[PDB]
Subunit: 342 residues, 4 copies
């Protein structure tokens, strides 16, 4: 038993500005999710039963990103949901697969529906089940793009690449709704996790996704600058009109339900998530607009016209909790709504 290092989350770090010749409106946000799949913006909606069904997946795709359709539904329903996305004009669609007895049956149905990428997503991606699962899928569908997760170490990146994964998803315990670190003791602060895993993925030619723990548009800039090809979000999208669930009103405020897929409610037991509510945000398009503007602003400050040189030119400093207080607005009574800050 040894203590390796201090590991950082997004709130621990800030990016140092670079000499720039590019204005935010001039930068480009295209990214390769896999070698075969390009996205116009590097944003993905989480594969959760309170975040992404076909309604969300279609809107994400029209905005330039992609939704991963959750697997808490019949194989038949999930193929139906993937098919609904694909027939809505050649939109990209993903679907979640689990390490289950019917894994291949479910894969078979979503490929029949022409899914563009599957996510073999589990609480612990660095495992015999996932590794063998990836190898079976690629042995039957060599061309099927496969994201495998979730992981938090460079050894996991190497092992899953070696299995045939086309992309790996990073994130153990940083989710807004996640208790894995509290109930199991396990996880890696997400900025260090993405940085160390992306470094290994660059050496092997495999992209990594930064999944969970993102709250503000500036957090996405950090995750991309740390080397992720894309950022996955549940909380930021669960309050949008296109996520599942009705709008509930209470004391003049509107809400949507959001819960971990390891929460008691979603599994219906020793849960690794919680259940609750988040503010209703309106249409996804308004949220995406603010995320993309802040990302383009950060790339302007970093002198990055596109996303590759962003990682190469990224220098972080660590801030203390007093630095964090300086970074947020302070010593002001904010009386007006800001569209990208709360």
């Amino acid at each position: 038993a040894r203590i390796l290092k201090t590991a950082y989350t997004f709130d621990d770090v800030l990016l140092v500005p670079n000499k720039s010749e590019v204005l935010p409106n001039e930068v480009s946000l295209k990214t390769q999710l896999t070698k075969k799949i390009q996205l116009n913006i590097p944003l993905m909606s989480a594969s959760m039963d309170t975040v992404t069904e076909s309604k969300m997946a279609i809107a994400m795709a029209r905005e330039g990103g992609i939704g991963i359709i959750h697997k808490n539904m019949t194989i038949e329903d999930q193929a139906r949901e993937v098919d609904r996305v694909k027939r809505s004009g050649g939109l990209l669609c993903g679907a979640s697969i689990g390490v289950t007895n019917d894994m291949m049956e479910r894969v078979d149905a979503v490929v029949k529906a022409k899914v563009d990428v599957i996510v073999l997503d589990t609480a612990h991606g660095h495992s015999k089940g996932v590794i063998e699962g990836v190898k079976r899928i690629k042995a039957k569908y060599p061309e099927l793009q496969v994201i495998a997760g979730n992981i938090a170490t460079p050894e996991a990146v190497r092992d899953l690449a070696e299995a045939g994964a086309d992309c790996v998803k990073v994130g153990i315990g940083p989710g807004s709704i996640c208790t894995t670190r509290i109930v199991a003791g396990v996880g890696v602060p997400q900025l260090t996790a993405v940085m160390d895993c992306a470094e290994e993925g660059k050496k092997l030619g495999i992209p990594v996704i930064a999944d969970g723990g993102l709250k503000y548009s500036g957090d996405i800039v950090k995750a991309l600058a740390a080397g992720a090809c894309a950022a996955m979000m549940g909380s930021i999208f669960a309050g949008c009109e296109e996520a599942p669930g009705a709008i509930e009103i209470y004391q003049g405020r509107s809400y949507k339900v959001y819960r971990g897929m390891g929460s008691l409610g979603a599994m219906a037991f020793v849960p690794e998530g919680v259940e609750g509510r988040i503010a209703y945000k309106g249409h996804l398009a308004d949220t995406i607009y603010q995320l993309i503007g802040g990302i383009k602003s950060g790339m302007g400050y970093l002198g990055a016209p596109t996303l590759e040189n962003l990682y190469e030119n990224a220098n972080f400093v660590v801030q203390t909790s007093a630095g964090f207080r300086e970074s947020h607005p302070h010593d002001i009574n904010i009386t007006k709504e800001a569209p990208n800050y709360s």
Copy 2:
């Protein structure tokens, strides 16, 4: 030129660190939680209830033993009552039982009584185990009862592990200042953050062949995983069990909520003074079995994440990272209004 620097080492508590996932070929339902409390005493689960007058009498010790762990009967009662309590556990189906002993004029009379009642382990229990009185107490007890299993505590340094081991202790108990009801660090200025204490003591124990117990400061199942991964053979809890039906004390209702009393053994109320503990209320939890179910499930999850089929394998292959207070905020659920109870998480 090169300058002089003050050598101050940082020590960590459970909330300072996280376990890094390992490659895993084991599912949580396949791991084994057996542990050796002492070379002679095996537990089916690595959990102990604290020797406190608001946590463990015979009712709790019986339930802990039936769940696969052990309870330590507290000594805030007559010698005859403590022997009766141990005896009641031992008559309830050969269950394991422990009893707390103090550095007192009547120490051996109390030891004799609980030995007569067939106690399986005594805990020579003190605020400062790395002391002349505890060292001599262990020697005297082992000279009279060479086969009697003795835990000695509490301590926080490898030197204390070495000295108590040389005195004849079969196991040592680590924890100066981490307990939820404890003020030792505040009033005396003394203690060691518990994750570092357990790690540094356990590593010395591993080299001497003596196990160590991680006593105090545990709040969530994941904290126990950290303590076991750091090398502790078992985890001792007061607060986590004190709200259970099987703990001493009536269930008290106030403004629609149910409470039980929990207090330090060094608080005024327990000692009845310069106290080193406080007295208060915690939420009623219901039956011990439901709390144990959640704790065990969390430990098994952690071992799955670390690929550990056994607790020795957990310790041998565990790596930690340090998190900052921002890391801690990410680790807990954040930016959500939690609306439903979770059986293993409360804020």
Copy 3:
């Protein structure tokens, strides 16, 4: 083939404290004079922010009368800004500064404030380490070789060097520390201010170019830290936005007096945002606030044995405090029942 990296820990004012020095100088014996630029001297090292809720001619006149300087904001027509500079210049030859953006009409605005005899212009931008600001400085110094130019905002030594080479007479440091700023949150970018000022001032001293510590200052002691770290001057928005001389009416809500204060990057000021809009306490007249700030600075210089600001820089030593140190540093374990004029909660 470079890779992303974590360079170091960087500190804000609340992270550090100045170690007392042997002193042979009482606080009333110290001199607060400073060179804003080689050409311009200030009797006290304080500047009011170039914002439409902080500085117009009323504030700039009062700042200059106190011995500092105000920068007239550019959220107005070119003609009105020229008029505002002119009102300041007329009142006894007081120093005045004016804000300029990287815009298509940049040189037209410069022309008009030069005509009004502005003493310094600030090429004010969110990201001063940029081609636009560099080319802007060069163009201005080509048409007006002796016009003093401050360029900002920046946070790195590289930026100091690049703007000095472009011809800047002074550089302004601050990416993200402002009270009303959200740059670090929405874009992910910035450098904690004490470290940003120390590292930029270190480069500036090597090149003979001063640097301004802009943003994030809350108490008079924070200004001492900024000056000890090598800044020639401190610029404040929040500390001045509540004064009588700031723009905006005095608003009363539930027995408390307020004034509006907002980021220039806020939706309201621009009518994707990087600032917020709110209200701060009304503080009465600028003179009362400056008195407390100056007294605090003089006290600090007494503690550090510094008769002059250059001596303060040369002999200042900092320690880092933890959040527990910070709790010690503030009053603690006391129910404060009387207002202190230089301390609020």
Copy 4:
């Protein structure tokens, strides 16, 4: 301009238990305030007009410590105060002195009242005025014991000892009522200040006082283990019935006034370096001292120290994070009973 190191306050550190052959009841709290002045317990009350006049100094001395009579009164009044303490049984008494035009005449008057020790008390002890003040006092009164302060660095210890100080007082900005670090930006977190200065004092044979920022008895143990010969407190004693000021009731709670000497109110008796407020009434000094001493004795038992010197020689600190601090305090308990040595 450079960052030297991280500096720590009491809440940043904990003492590691030692092997112990001494029980808390077997330890000795005796200490040398100066080479000439022994205290039976290592505690002093602050020279503040809401903490120490003759009533508090007499009570402090009878408990084995010492009070420093504040100077916010006429020279004649301060002499009478000192005189009351000395006539109450040869009790030890101290008196504060400022860097003032009447400095020597104030010293003359308290010397005639037979003060045991004067404290050349100032915001910045590492200054020419204090250095020359000490030299002048020791020139006229070579045997008069002189504490000089306040300071926060080893260099200040050296310069003050060279001036002739018999003891130096450490604390720039730790006071509960102090705003020095906020308004002037200056100070050193108190545990590091005491450790650095006391180590310098030990080399020179000059003791150092840990003055300010103490909240709990364990904070004093840390100050003494860091090498301080004594601890000085305002807040911990200002609520005692022997402190100046009436007991005031507000909404069923009892309070006394407590304020910095550099607050407006105290200076009026303007850029201040302190605040004014109220703290809880604590009853008689004896009950507070009893808890402080018990906690110190417990700490010394944990460290196996029969004496304050052995405590310093064998003390090892570790640093704790804010998560460590949350563990060190009681946590996850609704406290429902008063404890005499713990509040929050």
